[PDB]
Amino acid sequence: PQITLWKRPLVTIRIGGQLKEALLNTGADNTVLEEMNLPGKWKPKMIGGIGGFIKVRQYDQIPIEICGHKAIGTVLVGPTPVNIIGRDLLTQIGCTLNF
Amino acid sequence: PQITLWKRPLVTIRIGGQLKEALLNTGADNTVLEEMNLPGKWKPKMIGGIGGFIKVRQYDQIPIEICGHKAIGTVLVGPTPVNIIGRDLLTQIGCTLNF
């Protein structure tokens, strides 16, 4: 559909059978979730935001459903204040910014 | 336009007669620019996200052109890593998220 930006663009996602709220975030290169357990191999990464840098774990080829859309891709996990769907998965689901 | 998210959504802005580049950020409540001199009264504020908080200056009723569309609103100024157009002004220029 079409999502207004008068309020934060929060949507339900589903990952590993858990329901979570995340923010559709054109200002994020990547998808970053609050601390959680995921299966398999991972690698540590440092990402930057508004106030400095945080450490995350990078997991690849994780299935995630984002407002009804099946996606499979990389998920970074760490101390983000809010779950973020970044450009890597917005593109996957066909999301554009229109004005 | 309908902007795709293959690349960071960096666009032309014009503020106080200066040409800059800014990131259209649906993950930001408010607009924050790198340090610059703007006219008029300001108030200090803190804004936060990944990596913690920074101290900014808040100016009101500032004209800014974003990708050709005129806006007038509240502009924060401070140590952000990139000029950021937030929802406050994305709404003004008619932005929605579409998928």
């Binding site: 923010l23 975030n25 200002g27 994020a28 290169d29 990547n30 970053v32 990464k45 440092m46 990402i47 930057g48 935001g49 508004i50 983000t80 204040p81 809010v82 973020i84 970044g86 | 990131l23 950020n25 993950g27 930001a28 409540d29 408010n30 924050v32 804004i47 936060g48 996200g49 990944i50 908080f53 952000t80 890593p81 990139v82 950021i84 937030g86």
Partner: peptide
């Protein structure tokens, strides 16, 4: 609450 979720890849 924080309000600016800029995020840059590694």
């Amino acid at each position: 609450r924080p309000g600016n979720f800029l995020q840059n890849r590694p």
